[PDB]
Amino acid sequence: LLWGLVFNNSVPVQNPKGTTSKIMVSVWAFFAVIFLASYTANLAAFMIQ
Amino acid sequence: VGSLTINEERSEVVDFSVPFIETGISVMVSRSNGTVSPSAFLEPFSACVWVMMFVMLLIVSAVAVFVFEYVTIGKAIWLLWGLVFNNSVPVQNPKGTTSKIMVSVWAFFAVIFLASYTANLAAFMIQEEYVDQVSGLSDKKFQRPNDFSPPFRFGTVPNGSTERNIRNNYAEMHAYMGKFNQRGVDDALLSLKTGKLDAFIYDAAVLNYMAGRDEGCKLVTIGSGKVFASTGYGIAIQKDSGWKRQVDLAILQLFGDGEMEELEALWLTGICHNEKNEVMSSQLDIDNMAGVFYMLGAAMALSLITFISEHLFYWQ
Amino acid sequence: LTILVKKEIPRSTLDSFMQPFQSTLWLLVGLSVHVVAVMLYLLDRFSTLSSAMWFSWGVLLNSGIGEGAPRSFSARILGMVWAGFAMIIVASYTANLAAFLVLDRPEERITGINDPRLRNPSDKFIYATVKQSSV
Amino acid sequence: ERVQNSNKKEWNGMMGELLSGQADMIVAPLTINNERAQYIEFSKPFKYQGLTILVKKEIPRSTLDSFMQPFQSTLWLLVGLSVHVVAVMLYLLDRFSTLSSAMWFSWGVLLNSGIGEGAPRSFSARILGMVWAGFAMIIVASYTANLAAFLVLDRPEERITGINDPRLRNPSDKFIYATVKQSSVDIYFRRQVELSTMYRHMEKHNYESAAEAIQAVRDNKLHAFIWDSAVLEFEASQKCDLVTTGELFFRSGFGIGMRKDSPWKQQVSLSILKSHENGFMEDLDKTWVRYQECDSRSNAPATLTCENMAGVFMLVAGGIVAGIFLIFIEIAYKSRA
């Protein structure tokens, strides 16, 4: 689950019951959205150069 | 021989020569720019294909009707919206789906279309020919300076023929520069560097020369350097001189050989001429989403329209 | 014959760094997440309150948290236009990364031997041409 | 022209007529030369322009056309079969410690889709699924990267360098220049010994009408035409597929010429100044010049037509009837099983 949270996940996952870790997903603040976009941006940079 | 503007006020007194240099008057300003393109940046993505998505919203839904012959049609439309989109929300799970194969027929069009879309947004971010100058002096920046809320105050040479031309043409902008006029052009350059002066009107030849001679050439003229008043540089001649015809013939000789390019190359070079480029824009605060917010609030009005129309449908 | 000069300082890397661009419109659009949550709550009020806030956070962050579509389809329509809003948000995010990582550098080079910074030298330019040399 | 009859240097054409007094004056794009001023009175230069070369505009490279598709002529279906391979090996990991669905689930985790299945009970299979997810993410990152490969950074640099191009200084058969007859640039090139690097080629391809020099560039015969900017930039900005070099080859202006000793010039040139003072010249520009009927030189290249994406939708339409036939086959399979 945390691997897919690093990734762009699609698979069905756990649903925790008494989760305050659902707030910790907002603390995760999607790092796919940050990191992968910056990664493909630098791949675009390397494709430029 | 100095650098005299050929004008009517001197031709009546002294005799002119053939102008060797075409020159003219423009306005030098120091500009700070960015990449400011509003919410219509998606004008390459024409909406005529976007409705081409929307009928593909419907037709496979009809095939879903036969999958419903084995929860409803109106529930799956936002599923298909998220299938266009990057969906995250929990959705339906169809039981006897061969439409799960039709998701592979969909072959994610988010993955194709959105990536191509942000690729072309990267292209437009690469290529946005942004300008900030105000050409067309009939704009209110020279007509109604107090209509904005900086008080625009411009300056020029007080003992200059250009301000005499300005008092001869418009009606009153010389008096608008009566608040401040700069003697000494380097003082005007430093005043525009320090943001005191708003705009400096002068002859665009020396303006172009000093702008190319400046290190960080954000101090540029208006537009492509196209002047509004244009003249030449002549020579003061004692009237009824027989030699001056021979002089002007010699000027046509100096135009015949092409040495004046080399004489300009004595000084023309070193310029950052080089200006249709793009500089980076950190944190650039564009507020084009306010236009998107106008679409948002309009949709909020539409939702209210649906709420009242449903309420009258509760009355029926 | 060549001229040696100092190398220019590099512009940016992971340093005092270009952060997310939202000095403005960061928390204000955060409050609009609360606004769209409560107006959809009002759309469900007269025809799921705190969860609706966090669900609206998740549909900002592309997260699968708990809730589904409301029973009024106009609220789902507003959710879809919100999803398009979040997608153009992240598209503009990728676009502003593309804004500052390429295309620009300070052009601070000489043009060759015909530079008027040497042909018409000022105080801001010093040349050595060391003693007893052929040059 | 030096007439060979008794060595007579007579100005050809209408200039000889006003030399003989057939007219008092002339309005024209009057090129100013030294040899003209020895016989002709001239006024102040009414127009300011320069010498430029007009050539044909380059064909645009790519849009939605016969289009750059997905790059996978190779590694398309083969990595598709590896989806089947990773599905069955994970099935084997569940076989000795969910078969056809595992194929479609592996398709979904290629396509970032939420189809049905979850993680297997063996955690090594989930580990292989995670490295497969990293594989699909570097697949789509490379997809965005190859879009970034071909939409920017490149164009064929097919421009002139200016007047010092050796394709004109040392001209070959693949370069044709017009320099139309009885023009001032012909005397200018006769005055330049450095333009004796072939001037005779320019005499061999001399033309008569400027519109024929336009058409021969449009017929791709003439490679370049030298003319004043005031005509060239305006006709290029009104009639497209023709672009200029932008480089000013020679500084020049247009005055008005009269015969000798007509005293009106003192008020004529001042009237040219007077029409300059009210901006009546700019009234002429607003009535004729500002109507530019073409696009800019900026190719921004960031433009998009969206007509040729329907070829993907045809594949969706073929998949529709394929799903209909598969529905019939599954109906028959329900009849069997």
Contact (CB, 8 A) for D132 and D151: no
Q: How many CB pairs under 8 A join B and C?
A: 119
In a 13 Å sphere around the CA of A28, the CA atoms on its Cβ side amount to: 21
Mutate to test the interface with B, among C62, C81, C111, C115 (most CBs of B within 10 A): C81
User: b vs e for B263-278, b when ≥16 Cβ sit within 10 Å of the residue's Cβ?
Assistant: eeeeeebbbeeeeeeb
Rounded to 10 deg, the angle between the B76-84 and C73-99 helix axes is 0
Does the CB of A37 have a partner CB in chain C at under 8 Å?
yes
Resolution in A: 5.2
Helix or strand holding residue B260 (H, E): helix B260-265
Residue type at position D154: D
What are the C-alpha distances in Å from B144 to residues B138, B155, B156, B176, C25?
A: 10, 16, 19, 10, 33
Contact (CB, 8 A) for D179 and D192: no
Contact (CB, 8 A) for D206 and D181: yes
Contact (CB, 8 A) for D130 and A7: yes
Residue D94 token pair:
């569940």
Q: What are phi and psi of D213, to 5 degrees?
A: -70, -30
Contact assignment for D34 to B8 by CB distance below 8 Å: no
What are the C-alpha distances in Å from D318 to residues C47, D81, D180, D229?
A: 43, 22, 60, 56
Q: Which chain A residues are within 8 Å of D108, Cβ to Cβ?
A: 10-11
D214 vs D236: CA distance, rounded Å: 10
Contact (CB, 8 A) for D126 and D119: yes
Mutate to test the interface with D, among B5, B8, B68, B239 (most CBs of D within 10 A): B8
Give start and end residues of each alpha helix (H) in chain B.
Answer: 8-11, 50-67, 76-84, 99-106, 109, 115-126, 161-169, 173-176, 185-193, 204-213, 243-257, 260-265, 289-315
Residue D284 token pair:
């002429």
Residue type at position B210: M
Q: Considering just the CA atoms, what is the radius of gyration of chain C in Å?
A: 29
Q: Which chain B residues are within 8 Å of D45, Cβ to Cβ?
A: 18-19, 22, 232
Alpha-carbon distance D61 to nearest alpha carbon in chain A (angstroms): 18
Q: Touching C: which chains, 3+ CB pairs < 8 A?
A: A, B
Contact (CB, 8 A) for C69 and A38: no
**Tokens 């390397």 -> residue:** A46
Does the CB of A11 have a partner CB in chain C at under 8 Å?
no
> What is the number of other CB atoms lying within 10 angstroms of the CB of residue B135?
13
Q: How many CB pairs under 8 A join A and D?
A: 51
D124 vs D107: CA distance, rounded Å: 19
Helix or strand holding residue B191 (H, E): helix B185-193
Contact (CB, 8 A) for D206 and D183: no
Q: Closest chain A residue to C54 measured between Cα atoms?
A: A23
C134 is in an annotated binding site: yes
B275-D304-B33 Cα angle (round to 5): 30
Alpha-carbon distance B174 to nearest alpha carbon in chain D (angstroms): 16
